[PDB]
Design an enzyme around this catalytic site. Structure first.
Site, mmCIF file in Angstrom:
data_model
loop_
_atom_site.group_PDB
_atom_site.id
_atom_site.type_symbol
_atom_site.label_atom_id
_atom_site.label_comp_id
_atom_site.label_asym_id
_atom_site.label_seq_id
_atom_site.Cartn_x
_atom_site.Cartn_y
_atom_site.Cartn_z
ATOM 1 N N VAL A 25 1.004 -1.032 0.025
ATOM 2 C CA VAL A 25 -0.036 0.110 0.087
ATOM 3 C C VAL A 25 0.893 1.206 0.111
ATOM 4 O O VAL A 25 0.475 2.482 0.334
ATOM 5 C CB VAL A 25 -0.976 0.121 1.197
ATOM 6 C CG1 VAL A 25 -2.001 -1.300 0.974
ATOM 7 C CG2 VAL A 25 -0.287 -0.088 2.254
ATOM 8 N N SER A 27 4.884 3.649 -0.164
ATOM 9 C CA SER A 27 5.981 3.734 0.595
ATOM 10 C C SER A 27 5.895 4.667 1.541
ATOM 11 O O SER A 27 4.847 5.556 1.322
ATOM 12 C CB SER A 27 7.335 4.401 -0.472
ATOM 13 O OG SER A 27 7.399 3.444 -1.598
ATOM 14 N N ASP A 163 4.702 10.550 9.570
ATOM 15 C CA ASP A 163 6.171 11.032 9.131
ATOM 16 C C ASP A 163 6.619 12.256 9.486
ATOM 17 O O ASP A 163 6.869 13.226 8.576
ATOM 18 C CB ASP A 163 5.906 11.021 7.239
ATOM 19 C CG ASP A 163 6.118 9.412 6.814
ATOM 20 O OD1 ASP A 163 5.784 9.218 5.474
ATOM 21 O OD2 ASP A 163 6.401 8.409 7.775
HETATM 22 N N1 LIG Z 1 -1.977 2.257 4.886
HETATM 23 C C1 LIG Z 1 -1.334 2.521 6.021
HETATM 24 N N2 LIG Z 1 -2.212 2.700 7.197
HETATM 25 C C2 LIG Z 1 -1.230 3.019 7.969
HETATM 26 C C3 LIG Z 1 -0.090 3.605 7.948
HETATM 27 C C4 LIG Z 1 0.698 3.555 6.779
HETATM 28 C C5 LIG Z 1 1.864 4.184 6.318
HETATM 29 C C6 LIG Z 1 2.998 3.869 7.306
HETATM 30 C C7 LIG Z 1 3.181 3.243 8.630
HETATM 31 C C8 LIG Z 1 3.934 3.984 9.580
HETATM 32 C C9 LIG Z 1 4.040 3.338 10.582
HETATM 33 C C10 LIG Z 1 3.822 1.767 10.909
HETATM 34 F F1 LIG Z 1 4.167 1.121 11.839
HETATM 35 C C11 LIG Z 1 3.090 1.252 9.764
HETATM 36 C C12 LIG Z 1 2.775 1.924 8.644
HETATM 37 N N3 LIG Z 1 3.918 4.868 6.665
HETATM 38 C C13 LIG Z 1 3.366 5.212 5.779
HETATM 39 N N4 LIG Z 1 2.126 5.006 5.369
HETATM 40 C C14 LIG Z 1 1.491 5.504 4.318
HETATM 41 C C15 LIG Z 1 1.586 4.533 2.975
HETATM 42 C C16 LIG Z 1 1.038 5.445 1.746
HETATM 43 N N5 LIG Z 1 0.380 6.803 2.123
HETATM 44 C C17 LIG Z 1 -0.557 6.410 3.346
HETATM 45 C C18 LIG Z 1 -0.019 6.156 4.554
HETATM 46 N N6 LIG Z 1 -0.270 3.219 5.640
#
Ligand SMILES: Nc1nccc(-c2c(-c3ccc(F)cc3)ncn2C2CCNCC2)n1
Ligand SMILES: CCCNS(=O)(=O)c1ccc(N2C(=O)C=CC2=O)cc1
Ligand SMILES: [Ca+2]
Ligand SMILES: [Ca+2]
Ligand SMILES: [Ca+2]
EC number: 2.7.11.24
Length: 347
Positions: A25, A27, A163
């Site tokens: 899903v 980066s 982020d």
């Molecule tokens: N779909 C989704 N759901 C929750 C978070 C993220 C996520 C994380 C992330 C951070 C920490 C973690 F422990 C797990 C995931 N980093 C970037 N993204 C993005 C991925 C693309 N844009 C939307 C969110 N993505």
């Protein structure tokens, strides 16, 4: 736990069998992310595999920084951790770090793109950003690059900030960055993030980017066209003489009345935008003050706008060796305590 391997985004992921049906899903900062099904709880999660976490002193300290930060963030509008794992059985094997959070389907760009948002809905979205910012700012953490793509949103419009780097190791949008960040002014405060909220909110109200500059000079000119030419005291903040001379040389522009810009908007939204989109960062409204603004009257609840526990950032000034950052990161992986599945109670 038993781990399994799966090639995702052209690289091997190694994850506990607890997490199933991984699919990419996108980066995130220094990592890539897969949606997964957590078979222990039946919940949908997002798993981020950090990219080359110990490849360099820059990556190693970034990895520690991110894990320490995410372990500290415990707020409903901020990405935090359900789990952190590594396939390594010891420090000597340790080369990969995976972070797990609740799955969020989209980002804010998915919300405003194909939908004329109601004002009540815009209120809810901005309210949540501000509530999350109040929390992070209370721990002396500044995002510095807040923008719609750093706001994760689910199918019910629930939103989380994510982020939120010292060193340079992709072309980012600068349209939402505070002027003091975009132009590298000598000092700035937590309200850099409030400028970004103003830019986001303006776009949710109009459907148009507020300051879509083609470069930093074009973006500055777009900003000054709205907020007016600043005083000499703002030049005090700018190191470069060439930059100061240029700004000083620009034809003077009056501040626009925002009521003439955001035609048809709720006058409370216009008033809030006037308080956020000011160049003088010391006169910009804070997150906690914005939460009290009448624009959010139907959502505001002081009992449910918490601050953060103190956050020790003393490591930021330290230069350690790569294996020291790696060992500290390993310690933080091993010491992680998962939160209860249900951490909330009726008010
Ligand atoms: N779909 C989704 N759901 C929750 C978070 C993220 C996520 C994380 C992330 C951070 C920490 C973690 F422990 C797990 C995931 N980093 C970037 N993204 C993005 C991925 C693309 N844009 C939307 C969110 N993505
Ligand atoms: C960047 C603004 C440039 N002016 S604009 O593009 O013509 C414009 C577009 C939308 C609105 N608006 C609101 O503010 C609230 C409902 C709505 O329609 C106002 C102005
Ligand atoms: Ca409430
Ligand atoms: Ca409960
Ligand atoms: Ca209450």
């Amino acid at each position: 736990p038993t781990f399994y391997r799966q090639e995702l985004n052209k690289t091997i992921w190694e994850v506990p069998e607890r997490y199933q049906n991984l699919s990419p899903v996108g980066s995130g900062a220094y990592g890539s992310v897969c949606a997964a099904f957590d078979t222990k709880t039946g919940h949908r999660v997002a798993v981020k595999k950090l990219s080359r976490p110990f490849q360099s002193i820059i990556h190693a300290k970034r990895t520690y920084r991110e894990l320490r930060l995410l372990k500290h963030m415990k707020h409903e509008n901020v990405i935090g951790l359900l789990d952190v794992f590594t396939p390594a059985r010891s420090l000597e094997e340790f080369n990969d770090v995976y972070l797990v959070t609740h799955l969020m389907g989209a980002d804010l760009n998915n919300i405003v793109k194909c939908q004329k948002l109601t004002d009540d809905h815009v209120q809810f979205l901005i309210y949540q950003i501000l509530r999350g910012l109040k929390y992070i700012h209370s721990a002396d953490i500044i995002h510095r690059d807040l923008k719609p793509s750093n706001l994760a949103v689910n199918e019910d419009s629930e939103l989380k900030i994510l982020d939120f780097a010292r060193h340079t190791d992709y072309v980012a949008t600068r349209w939402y960055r505070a002027p003091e960040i975009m132009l590298n002014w000598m000092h700035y405060n937590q309200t850099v993030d409030i400028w970004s909220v103003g830019c986001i909110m303006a776009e949710l109200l109009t459907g148009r980017t507020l300051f879509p500059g083609t470069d930093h000079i074009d973006q500055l000119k777009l900003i000054l066209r709205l907020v007016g030419t600043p005083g000499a005291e703002l030049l005090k903040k700018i190191s470069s003489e060439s930059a100061r001379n240029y700004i000083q040389s620009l034809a003077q522009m009056p501040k626009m009345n925002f009521a003439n810009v955001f035609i048809g908007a709720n006058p409370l939204a216009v008033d809030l935008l006037e308080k956020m989109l000011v160049l003088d960062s010391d006169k910009r409204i804070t997150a906690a003050q914005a939460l009290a603004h009448a624009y959010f009257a139907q959502y505001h609840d002081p009992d449910d706008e918490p601050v953060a526990d103190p956050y020790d950032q003393s490591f930021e000034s330290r230069d350690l060796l790569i294996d020291e950052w790696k060992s500290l990161t390993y310690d933080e992986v091993i010491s992680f305590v998962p939160p209860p599945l249900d951490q909330e109670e009726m008010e």
